[PDB]
Symmetry: C3
Subunit: 223 residues, 3 copies
């Protein structure tokens, strides 16, 4: 209880836990091979996120990266959580639109480079290079959202306004969800430094819960 | 030859090596696409295990984790071996019972969290938190064995006592094999500390050889 | 600009970048599910390689491994690049010859052990053990080239001299490409030490560009 952001990591850990159990209880009784997959993926996302947030809460997923003449603490576990949960989420969207394996491998591969370079930008001691990796990381994000924005609209083509409105909203939500992360990274203590550490943890905690748990609800509430 | 457990790591490395060659020689001459898979998986398990045990034998896979006011050495390579070989083993069992991709992804994902959290519990400097990760790690193990225990019995249903007895034994063996690991971790120098380090290495060495090599024999001795 | 090999890492980074864009621009307009895969794999190889070479260029992928009584710098990012790009390349060759999943899993699994043990040999402080891991790493390479040499010739069997000559050349090129790496490692500052560091970076830079970018051209120039 020495860090001023322990409350957020606690709420995050708890929310990730409750979300996991909900998906676990509701996931029992499914024998359809295709429905079981959507329940296995959406349930592992918060399961991984819960364990990652417990490490930060216990201070295990925190390190000191001396950049800018200061010992700015960097929660490396956050990127680990995104590394294992962002591809799983892309799989729920891929199977939804029924994209070919080529489209999937490109999205996953681009996601790894996005998170990969993103972590380097956070572990760099030179302040100028930190944003270099940020530019490449973000560039990989645009590609993911580009294919998603294109792959989603093509699924709701033809003529079905009632059903077409469903895929159009899920598309927009995804674009704004992924886009919020690089913005919080730029203004937080890991980029520019306008937002202090405690408020930074709050922003990412809201985005993770909204994605790992929140988005998992809207996705599995579809037939 | 300064550590009192170098003999066990030596025997382990040797046994993993002999097991690999046996599977490699016996694996030649297989053209059946489905039979080649069972030979590729069962052969990589000891191949990985052999390299992991050579690192501990040479002192490369050993670190000092100061917990409990002592510099207890922790063989991190052990978890690395389990991390890459436990999912492969689950694949031999999955293809055997012919489980759907949903069941497989849930088992693999739960296995990563099991080994993942398990390693954190071994790299924690706070004695109280070490067992917290142990509880979560074990909880992930129960899920794997739950689905296995359920998925295996369903394969030997209908009426075939002669063939049904085969799947019932492999099931029991797997339950007792995976269950032994968390017990050795709890009593060893990484948990409570009732068993010294040298005896701990012996227990895990017997379990690994029995699994990576021993279990690989019984599995490939089936038509 | 303090290291005498910054020029090579710069050229490498630039070449990896140009190669990526070329594959990215030329990869647009492909709707064939099978053709998109070959474009997704061949494009991620240089994309990963570009990011890995930018880390070494910026000094992020470099560490000091005290072996032989000297602080020999070891570019660990090189192995990371090979770790994520060598399996992707094997996939382009697998889908080309249309190998069964068993053959693929064995090649990929053997490739991980090859790069895995290879990195240990480069991070070992004992000069004698460095070559031990080199022997195992190379041994895993021979297996990959053995299956490749066997799997490639079988694709050009029957009677088609015009088309058969195509697969026979790609085979030979691959054998000589993979074989060059362990040779440069043995003579460089990471093994024997006959070749200085700056010349070592040049050799690997030529081999990586030839593989990640160069070989990617010849592979995608086939119908
Ligand atoms: C937790 C769930 C999701 C979908 C998280 C997504 C996060 C990102 C796309 C973050 C990307 C980053 C960028 C673009 C640049 C700085 C490093 C980040 C990882 C924050
Ligand atoms: C080597 C082959 C197998 C099947 C090994 C399995 C090992 C485990 C399931 C170990 C699990 C652990 C638990 C439950 C808690 C402490 C950390 C361990 C990894 C030892
Ligand atoms: C970058 C593209 C390719 C195909 C690179 C391949 C590299 C190897 C097969 C290197 C193998 C090694 C060996 C055999 C021994 C020392 C460690 C190395 C990784 C250099």
């Amino acid at each position: 209880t020495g860090r001023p952001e322990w409350i957020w990591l606690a709420l995050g850990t708890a929310l990730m836990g409750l979300g996991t159990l909900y998906f676990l209880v509701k996931g029992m009784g499914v024998s359809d091979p295709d429905a079981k997959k959507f329940y296995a993926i959406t349930t592992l996302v918060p399961a991984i996120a819960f364990t990652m947030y417990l490490s930060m809460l216990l201070g295990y997923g925190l390190t000191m990266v001396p950049f800018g003449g200061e010992q700015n603490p960097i929660y490396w576990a956050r990127y680990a959580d995104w590394l294992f949960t962002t591809p799983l989420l892309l799989l729920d969207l891929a199977l939804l639109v029924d994209a070919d394996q080529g489209t999937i491998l490109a999205l996953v591969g681009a996601d790894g480079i996005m998170i990969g370079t993103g972590l380097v930008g956070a572990l760099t001691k030179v302040y100028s290079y930190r944003f270099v990796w940020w530019a490449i990381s973000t560039a990989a994000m645009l590609y993911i959202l580009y294919v998603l924005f294109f792959g989603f609209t093509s699924k709701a083509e033809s003529m079905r306004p009632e059903v077409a409105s469903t895929f159009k909203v899920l598309r927009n939500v995804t674009v704004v969800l992924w886009s919020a992360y690089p913005v919080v990274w730029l203004i937080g203590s890991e980029g520019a430094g306008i937002v202090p550490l405690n408020i930074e943890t709050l922003l990412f905690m809201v985005l993770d819960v909204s994605a790992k748990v929140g988005f998992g609800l809207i996705l599995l509430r579809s037939r």
